[PDB]
Protein backbone atom coordinates (compact mmCIF):
# COMPACT_ATOMS: atom_id res chain seq x y z
CA UNK A 1 0.00 0.00 0.00
CA UNK A 2 0.98 3.60 -0.66
CA UNK A 3 -0.79 6.81 0.34
CA UNK A 4 -1.48 9.64 -2.09
CA UNK A 5 -1.91 12.15 0.74
CA UNK A 6 -1.70 12.07 4.52
CA UNK A 7 -2.23 14.57 7.32
CA UNK A 8 -1.49 14.78 11.02
CA UNK A 9 -3.34 16.28 13.95
CA UNK A 10 -1.95 15.86 17.46
CA UNK A 11 -4.15 16.69 20.43
CA UNK A 12 -3.55 17.34 24.16
CA UNK A 13 -0.18 15.57 24.05
CA UNK A 14 1.57 15.23 27.40
CA UNK A 15 5.30 14.77 27.48
CA UNK A 16 5.83 11.87 29.85
CA UNK A 17 7.58 8.58 30.35
CA UNK A 18 4.34 6.84 29.37
CA UNK A 19 2.43 7.18 26.11
CA UNK A 20 0.83 10.41 27.26
CA UNK A 21 0.46 11.80 23.74
CA UNK A 22 -2.37 11.07 21.33
CA UNK A 23 -2.52 12.11 17.69
CA UNK A 24 -4.85 11.51 14.76
CA UNK A 25 -3.60 10.81 11.25
CA UNK A 26 -5.75 11.17 8.15
CA UNK A 27 -4.76 9.65 4.84
CA UNK A 28 -5.73 8.80 1.28
CA UNK A 29 -4.36 5.48 0.04
CA UNK A 30 -4.24 3.60 -3.23
CA UNK A 31 -5.15 0.36 -1.45
CA UNK A 32 -5.90 -1.26 1.89
CA UNK A 33 -3.24 -3.13 3.82
CA UNK A 34 -0.87 -3.12 6.77
CA UNK A 35 1.29 -0.04 6.56
CA UNK A 36 4.11 0.58 9.04
CA UNK A 37 4.15 3.69 11.18
CA UNK A 38 7.16 5.28 12.81
CA UNK A 39 8.39 8.48 14.41
CA UNK A 40 11.49 9.70 12.63
CA UNK A 41 12.10 12.24 15.39
CA UNK A 42 14.83 11.10 17.77
CA UNK A 43 12.84 12.62 20.66
CA UNK A 44 9.42 11.03 20.10
CA UNK A 45 8.15 7.51 19.59
CA UNK A 46 4.80 5.97 18.69
CA UNK A 47 3.29 3.01 20.51
CA UNK A 48 1.60 1.54 17.44
CA UNK A 49 3.97 0.01 14.91
CA UNK A 50 1.59 -0.87 12.05
CA UNK A 51 -1.98 -0.09 11.04
CA UNK A 52 -4.27 -1.65 8.45
CA UNK A 53 -4.75 1.24 6.06
CA UNK A 54 -7.83 1.83 3.89
CA UNK A 55 -8.26 3.52 0.52
CA UNK A 56 -9.27 6.52 2.63
CA UNK A 57 -9.51 6.83 6.38
CA UNK A 58 -7.95 8.02 9.59
CA UNK A 59 -6.27 6.30 12.52
CA UNK A 60 -5.39 7.52 16.00
CA UNK A 61 -2.05 6.53 17.50
CA UNK A 62 -0.66 6.77 20.99
CA UNK A 63 2.77 8.30 21.40
CA UNK A 64 5.27 9.40 24.03
CA UNK A 65 7.93 12.09 24.04
CA UNK A 66 10.08 14.22 26.29
CA UNK A 67 9.86 17.32 24.09
CA UNK A 68 7.43 19.91 25.51
CA UNK A 69 6.28 20.49 21.93
CA UNK A 70 5.01 17.84 19.52
CA UNK A 71 7.04 19.22 16.60
CA UNK A 72 8.05 15.78 15.39
CA UNK A 73 8.01 14.09 12.00
CA UNK A 74 5.62 11.16 11.60
CA UNK A 75 5.74 8.68 8.75
CA UNK A 76 3.03 6.33 7.47
CA UNK A 77 4.14 3.93 4.73
CA UNK A 78 7.04 6.34 4.19
CA UNK A 79 5.12 9.55 3.54
CA UNK A 80 5.71 12.25 6.12
CA UNK A 81 3.76 15.07 7.78
CA UNK A 82 4.95 17.61 10.34
CA UNK A 83 2.89 17.19 13.51
CA UNK A 84 2.97 20.03 16.00
CA UNK A 85 1.32 20.82 19.33
CA UNK A 86 2.27 22.36 22.66
CA UNK A 87 2.46 19.37 24.97
CA UNK A 88 1.55 20.12 28.60
CA UNK A 89 3.70 19.06 31.57
CA UNK A 90 2.67 15.69 33.02
CA UNK A 91 0.01 15.60 35.70
CA UNK A 92 1.75 13.09 38.00
CA UNK A 93 5.33 13.75 39.07
CA UNK A 94 6.18 10.05 39.44
CA UNK A 95 5.29 7.03 37.32
CA UNK A 96 5.95 3.30 37.58
CA UNK A 97 7.63 2.98 34.19
CA UNK A 98 10.94 4.26 32.77
Amino acid sequence: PTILEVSCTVADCIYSADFGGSLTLQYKADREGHCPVHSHSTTAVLKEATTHVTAVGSITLHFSTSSPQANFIVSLCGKKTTCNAECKPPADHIIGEP
Binding site: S22, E48, I59, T60
Partner: protein
Protein backbone atom coordinates in the same frame (compact mmCIF):
# COMPACT_ATOMS: atom_id res chain seq x y z
CA UNK B 1 -43.62 36.57 73.57
CA UNK B 2 -40.82 38.71 72.09
CA UNK B 3 -38.72 36.00 70.43
CA UNK B 4 -38.54 37.77 67.10
CA UNK B 5 -38.21 35.54 64.09
CA UNK B 6 -36.41 32.19 64.27
CA UNK B 7 -33.26 31.59 62.26
CA UNK B 8 -35.14 29.09 60.09
CA UNK B 9 -36.88 32.14 58.63
CA UNK B 10 -33.79 34.36 58.76
CA UNK B 11 -30.58 32.51 57.92
CA UNK B 12 -29.00 33.76 54.69
CA UNK B 13 -27.80 31.71 51.71
CA UNK B 14 -31.02 29.72 51.87
CA UNK B 15 -29.68 27.53 54.66
CA UNK B 16 -32.31 25.17 55.92
CA UNK B 17 -31.89 24.69 59.66
CA UNK B 18 -32.23 21.29 61.29
CA UNK B 19 -32.05 20.45 64.97
CA UNK B 20 -30.85 17.40 66.88
CA UNK B 21 -28.02 18.02 66.03
CA UNK B 22 -28.10 21.74 65.23
CA UNK B 23 -26.96 22.09 61.63
CA UNK B 24 -27.43 24.03 58.41
CA UNK B 25 -28.63 21.89 55.50
CA UNK B 26 -28.62 22.33 51.71
CA UNK B 27 -27.07 25.75 52.17
CA UNK B 28 -25.65 27.36 49.02
CA UNK B 29 -22.56 29.51 49.58
CA UNK B 30 -19.15 29.83 47.89
CA UNK B 31 -17.19 27.13 46.10
CA UNK B 32 -15.91 23.73 47.20
CA UNK B 33 -12.40 22.76 46.03
CA UNK B 34 -12.57 19.15 44.89
CA UNK B 35 -9.88 16.64 43.92
CA UNK B 36 -10.69 13.11 42.78
CA UNK B 37 -8.17 10.33 42.07
CA UNK B 38 -10.65 8.54 39.82
CA UNK B 39 -9.75 4.88 39.18
CA UNK B 40 -7.83 4.95 35.94
CA UNK B 41 -9.53 1.72 34.88
CA UNK B 42 -12.45 4.08 34.15
CA UNK B 43 -10.56 5.67 31.27
CA UNK B 44 -10.53 4.24 27.77
CA UNK B 45 -7.56 4.48 25.44
CA UNK B 46 -7.68 7.42 23.07
CA UNK B 47 -7.13 4.98 20.20
CA UNK B 48 -9.95 2.70 21.33
CA UNK B 49 -12.28 5.57 22.14
Amino acid sequence: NNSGRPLQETAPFGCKIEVEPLRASNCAYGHIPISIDIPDAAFVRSSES
